[PDB]
Amino acid sequence: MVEATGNNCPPHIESFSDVEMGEIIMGNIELTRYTRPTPVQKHAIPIIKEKRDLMACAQTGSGKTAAFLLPILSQIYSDGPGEALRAMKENGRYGRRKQYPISLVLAPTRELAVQIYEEARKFSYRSRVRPCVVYGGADIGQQIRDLERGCHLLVATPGRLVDMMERGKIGLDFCKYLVLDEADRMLDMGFEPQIRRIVEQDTMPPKGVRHTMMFSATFPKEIQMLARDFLDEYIFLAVGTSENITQKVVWVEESDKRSFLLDLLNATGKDSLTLVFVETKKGADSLEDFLYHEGYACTSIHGDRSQRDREEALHQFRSGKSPILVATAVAARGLDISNVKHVINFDLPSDIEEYVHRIGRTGRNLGLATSFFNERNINITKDLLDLLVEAKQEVPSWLENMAYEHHY
Numbered sequence: 211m212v213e214a215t216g217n218n219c220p221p222h223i224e225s226f227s228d229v230e231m232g233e234i235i236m237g238n239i240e241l242t243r244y245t246r247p248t249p250v251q252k253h254a255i256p257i258i259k260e261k262r263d264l265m266a267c268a269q270t271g272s273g274k275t276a277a278f279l280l281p282i283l284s285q286i287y288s289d290g291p292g293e294a295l296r297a298m299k300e301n302g303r304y305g306r307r308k309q310y311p312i313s314l315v316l317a318p319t320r321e322l323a324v325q326i327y328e329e330a331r332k333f334s335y336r337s338r339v340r341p342c343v344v345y346g347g348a349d350i351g352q353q354i355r356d357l358e359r360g361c362h363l364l365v366a367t368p369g370r371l372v373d374m375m376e377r378g379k380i381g382l383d384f385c386k387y388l389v390l391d392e393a394d395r396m397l398d399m400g401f402e403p404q405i406r407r408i409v410e411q412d413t414m415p416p417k418g419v420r421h422t423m424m425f426s427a428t429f430p431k432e433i434q435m436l437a438r439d440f441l442d443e444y445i446f447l448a449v450g451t452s453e454n455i456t457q458k459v460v461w462v463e464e465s466d467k468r469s470f471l472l473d474l475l476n477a478t479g480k481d482s483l484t485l486v487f488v489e490t491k492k493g494a495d496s497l498e499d500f501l502y503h504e505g506y507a508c509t510s511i512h513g514d515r516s517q518r519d520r521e522e523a524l525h526q527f528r529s530g531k532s533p534i535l536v537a538t539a540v541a542a543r544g545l546d547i548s549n550v551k552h553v554i555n556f557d558l559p560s561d562i563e564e565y566v567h568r569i570g571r572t573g574r575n576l577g578l579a580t581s582f583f584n585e586r587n588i589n590i591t592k593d594l595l596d597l598l599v600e601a602k603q604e605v606p607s608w609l610e611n612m613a614y615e616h617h618y
């Protein structure tokens with residue numbers, strides 16, 4: 211889970227439409243095919259939309275890039291500087307030869323800057339904002355020519371940005387959004403003097419005028435001290451498994467799933483915790499009852515359970531008194547369940563996205579996900595095949611077969 215702490219902290223959201231980001235952003239989100247905000251996004255988006263400074267301890271895989279880009283671009287579209295007044299300000303003797311970014315994102319490496327820039331383009335599509343990216347280790351002439359086409363949003367490595375500033379190619383006078391991404395890694399690389407020259411020693415509006423966000427995977431003292439210097443009345447956001455997981459997919463008819471489950475639980479040793487996902491609340495109650503009467507210590511959680519029922523279930527699971535948890539996915543979202551050795555998709559979900567999040571509960575090191583598949587699940591065939599192949603897992607032969615069927 212995610213915790214956010216500070217004075218008057220805006221509450222989190224559940225979906226992108228919970229804040230009014232406008233039609234350009236919302237249409238771009240549909241093109242990007244994000245369906246719901248990740249945990250860091252759920253917190254960071256309303257924080258940024260409310261114009262609050264943010265210190266976020268979060269890493270890659272978080273969705274931290276869109277967590278900052280979405281609300282920043284949204285604000286620029288909603289209430290960015292007036293076009294014509296701004297052109298008067300930026301038009302020199304030779305035309306627009308120096309650019310004045312509304313938003314600056316600092317990043318440690320060319321590879322990270324480029325990723326942030328590519329995500330920005332996904333969200334700046336059909337808007338007035340042209341993002342741009344500059345980085346060390348590549349021809350500067352080329353970058354300067356590109357800046358001249360427009361950077362309302364500039365992504366940059368710190369050394370190359372200082373170079374651009376010294377050359378008079380970039381002005382920070384109107385820069386209203388500053389993001390430091392992987393701030394820890396930037397300090398590790400010795401960029402702090404460059405960052406201080408960018409932020410404190412030139413023309414960037416000071417904290418409380420500009421809006422500032424910092425992201426790092428770690429939070430040492432030096433980062434807390436940078437946050438204190440750079441951030442005004444900020445909120446502290448702390449976020450609490452990829453290929454550590456063996457994935458088994460087996461063909462199981464509905465009337466066979468309980469028996470198949472028993473065999474899986476019989477092969478379980480130790481105190482290994484098992485998470486069993488089912489489709490429905492009824493399904494959860496019914497399966498927990500079957501297991502109890504079969505002599506298994508298990509518990510269950512779903513949406514119609516009280517907060518007390520839920521706390522009691524988690525207590526037994528976490529002590530390992532009842533080392534099998536039966537859950538609907540909607541019920542498991544948000545609660546802390548880590549040391550799961552085995553995730554069982556007793557029923558598969560309709561979307562491969564939900565599949566990925568479910569199996570992400572095991573091996574945060576060794577982990578196992580076993581999924582029961584039948585005719586009800588034809589619709590995820592190709593996406594599941596793509597996922598298995600990508601993770602270098604065993605692909606059932608019948609799955610590759612079904613994947614290419616044009617007759618059934």
Ligand SMILES: Nc1ncnc2c1ncn2[C@@H]1O[C@H](COP(=O)(O)O)[C@@H](O)[C@H]1O
Nearest residue numbers: 244246247248270271272273274275276
């Ligand atoms: N709401 C979302 N839904 C699905 N994928 C996302 C979402 N937000 C970010 N991502 C993806 O998550 C991955 C890691 O993002 P990041 O942590 O921003 O490096 C990238 O592939 C993003 O495109």
